[PDB]
């Protein structure tokens, strides 16, 4: 099984011989670079190169490894930074993995799955309260560039430190320097003992870019089949689509709409369908996917955005203008919907967020009218004050996730009008000092919420909040 290159250029090659090569195989060049064998012809083989091809010359010898694309997996990869292939990027020598899995594998069947019921705690008040997520779900986060998507991903991954989750972060087409900054930010908060990072920077060959999510999903599926919860994040799917378009065009594939090939829906569907909530017979493992899509000018109506929205079980829309105004993280009420939402939420969170939604929507529409008309009756004025306090409550500082129990406590304090006489600005400091008061006094409430997932007695909770209000000083 030996062959010689007869053509090379743009990252593709043609080889003579190789009589026994299998479709989808990996081949090793004379210098040592690896490639796929995508197309087999009557008398030549087409090869796709997954690295620097500058050293490949006509007449060079190419040999086949004897195996389909195999990404190594195992616990040995936790804390490392790896290529889409099984090679390290952070130094620290080799990984010494246990076993390998082919990236192109059949997804579990229908019969094999189960409904999503256990929640995923992001630690972001707005997301947890209004757009809940469950384990095994697939929710899309969509927005413009420089809107805070990666900040939300990091805040979510950090909050998983308490739970039993395993996390995987796949950087696609990102700048290497911000990837290094993100890795050092993860280490700074100590989240590296349960995470894996797979990277494919913008300077890499296009073939490596679309292969990254499949390596990520193979690594995640290794753990899930053994009964572990896994959370995979893709920061840039659209760049994977662009890299696949490039690779297809270099193969002279006739285009479609835009000039994307027909595989656009096939690619993303075959990728995102492997996130599931396995049945008790399989082992009960769960794999949650959080793909990110970047849209132009904030318009959600486009080929790739709507194509992905057709697949996912919901979406979160992040607005750029609100991001510039200082509100973090910006979320659009109208376009953010979750179809699994309401089943994952614990009882208290549901009981309070139900009122929270109505208050926020009423304030939104009333404010949308107020800019034109200033003549408002007492009821509308009280509604506006409530809405303003509500929108102030949902503010969150960077990289500081909040536990669910303090969220439900503060939102309960909001709903029942405990902030009637507290001015708007004092509300934030009210939240911090209330967290302190809960830490020193309300430990029983926190433990009850943790163990029981239910709201404590109204009278004792009101007594505690009243005591803190008695302590609190305005301005």
């Amino acid at each position: 099984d030996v062959g010689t290159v007869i053509q090379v250029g743009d990252g593709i090659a043609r080889a003579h011989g190789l009589d026994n090569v299998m479709s989808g195989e990996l081949v090793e060049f004379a210098n040592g670079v690896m490639g796929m064998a995508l197309n087999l012809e009557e008398n030549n083989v087409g090869i796709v190169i997954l690295g620097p091809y500058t050293g490949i010359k006509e007449g060079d010898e190419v040999r086949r490894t004897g195996r389909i694309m195999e990404v190594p997996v195992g616990e040995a990869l936790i804390g490392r930074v790896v290529n889409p292939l099984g090679q390290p990027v952070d130094g620290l020598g080799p990984v010494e993995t246990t076993e390998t899995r082919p990236i192109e594998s059949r997804a579990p069947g229908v019969m094999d799955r189960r409904s999503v019921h256990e929640p995923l705690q992001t630690g972001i008040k707005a997301i947890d309260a209004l757009v809940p997520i469950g384990r095994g779900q697939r929710e899309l986060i969509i927005g413009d560039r420089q809107t805070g998507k990666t900040s939300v991903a990091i805040d979510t991954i950090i909050n998983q430190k308490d739970q039993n989750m395993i996390s995987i972060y796949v950087a696609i087409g990102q700048k290497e320097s911000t990837v290094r900054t993100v890795v050092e930010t993860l280490r700074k908060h100590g989240a590296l003992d349960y995470t894996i990072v797979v990277t494919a920077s913008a300077s890499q060959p296009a073939p490596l870019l679309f292969l990254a999510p499949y390596a990520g999903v193979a690594m995640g599926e290794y753990f899930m089949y053994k009964g572990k919860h896994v959370l995979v994040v893709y920061d840039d799917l659209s760049k994977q689509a662009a890299a696949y378009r490039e690779l297809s065009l270099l193969l002279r594939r006739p285009p479609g709409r835009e000039a994307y090939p027909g595989d656009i829906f096939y690619l993303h569907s075959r990728l995102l369908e492997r996130a599931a909530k396995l049945s008790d017979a399989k082992g009960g493992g769960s794999l949650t996917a959080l793909p990110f899509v970047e849209t132009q000018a904030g318009d959600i109506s486009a080929y790739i955005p709507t194509n992905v929205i057709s697949i996912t079980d919901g979406q979160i829309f992040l607005q750029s203008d609100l991001f510039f105004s200082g509100v973090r993280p910006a979320i659009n009420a109208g376009l953010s919907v979750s179809r699994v939402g309401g089943a994952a939420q614990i009882k208290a969170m549901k009981k309070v967020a139900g009122t929270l939604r109505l208050d926020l929507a009423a304030y939104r529409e009333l404010e949308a009218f107020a800019q034109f008309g200033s003549d408002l009756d007492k009821a509308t004025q009280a509604k506006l004050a409530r809405g303003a306090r509500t929108v102030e409550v949902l503010k969150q500082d960077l990289h500081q996730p909040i536990p669910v129990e303090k969220q439900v406590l503060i939102i309960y304090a909001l709903t029942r009008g405990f902030l009637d006489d507290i001015p708007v600005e004092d509300v934030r400091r009210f939240e911090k000092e209330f967290y302190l008061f809960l830490d020193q006094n309300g430990q029983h409430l926190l433990e009850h919420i943790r163990t029981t997932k239910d709201l404590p007695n109204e009278d004792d909770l009101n007594k505690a909040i009243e005591a803190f209000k008695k302590t609190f000083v305005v301005s």
Binding site: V21, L40, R270, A276, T306
Partner: protein, 470 residues
Amino acid sequence: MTRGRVIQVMGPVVDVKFENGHLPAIYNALKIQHKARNENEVDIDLTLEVALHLGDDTVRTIAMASTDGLIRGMEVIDTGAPISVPVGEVTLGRVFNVLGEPIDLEGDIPADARRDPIHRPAPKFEELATEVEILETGIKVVDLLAPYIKGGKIGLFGGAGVGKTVLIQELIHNIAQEHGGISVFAGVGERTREGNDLYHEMKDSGVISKTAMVFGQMNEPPGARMRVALTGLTMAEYFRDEQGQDVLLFIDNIFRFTQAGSEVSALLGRMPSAVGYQPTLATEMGQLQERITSTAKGSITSIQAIYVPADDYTDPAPATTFSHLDATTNLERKLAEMGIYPAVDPLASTSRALAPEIVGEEHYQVARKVQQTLQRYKELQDIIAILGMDELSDEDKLVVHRARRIQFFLSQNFHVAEQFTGQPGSYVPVKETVRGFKEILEGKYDHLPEDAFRLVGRIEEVVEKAKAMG
């Protein structure tokens, strides 16, 4: 039989060469079965579908699953016929894939069971029916304002969470109960989560025994996503032809069938068309839907759920699909918030059957007279909002008074809702529906509380319930 050897592989496309001088037909199925001789090889078991003849004793095929591992010189066997699906009573209550294998964990179909090819010519001009016949579902508003017709296509337009599955299961239950007609559900290019939810919702309602399900989901290769509808069709066609009963066929999404066909045409090397669609779109869509017809022995009425990702109907797919439609039922979430079920829009729903030559005079008269009052109330509501009702004319007050009661009377206490709320379930005939609506209009049941009408079947129950309430 004859066995060929592979010469080319690329994506879902494979090419085979036959030496013995006998070559497969255009639609024949071929199978590859190889056991790995060494660790350098991989065990493969793949089914192929022929597409083209290319000369030099060579043929072209489209694969139904991933082609990884194929080698030149590998043997391919010709079955001599298209994809053969097992048909009969053995299919009820079971889930199949495209190739006719059972997905559900309840055993396998016996070897000797008869199997019929998926591809066959459509029925001829002489064999069709001659008069349009209404299909009685038992749902008040559906039968009144937008009747169904046997052999017709009904388009379902609604979003997730507006009650689609409740209506689907209610239709399956009613058709199985009265007309003695089984149903077939085919899933094409949908989320597997919704497939699991539908399966569990059917199992929790006792319907699964009366239906057969074929699933091809988003993850599948294009060829299976194309032919899943055809295997479901032949499953229903067996019941229509041999058993002579009427059949109801549900299709999850008509759009992705055309999308998969476009993908397969692009892979095959044909020149594209407008918006990059396949040149062969219209004949493929016709060949699928022209087998769904009402013959002398029996009929296959089909309910097709159509979802357009961009809400633009000018594209070739919505254009071609709408050309075959006969009626359209549109679901609205505003009435679901109001509490009316199954929340079909009375003003926006249409059917080509609502003509006196088909439905009779009284049905048309009552439908139009009701729709007049509904439109008048819809217009009058904003005037009621801006200006006080008391200042308005007596005629407008009377119109509102009748309109609210009529709008409430549209609702019905379904069968499947028996468990979430304790309800017997009502099945209403068309004639009593018409009589009740006319008597509501005239004023026989005028002096009753509007609360009584909220969830009732036939009209006498309205009086009994109102007398009980007060």
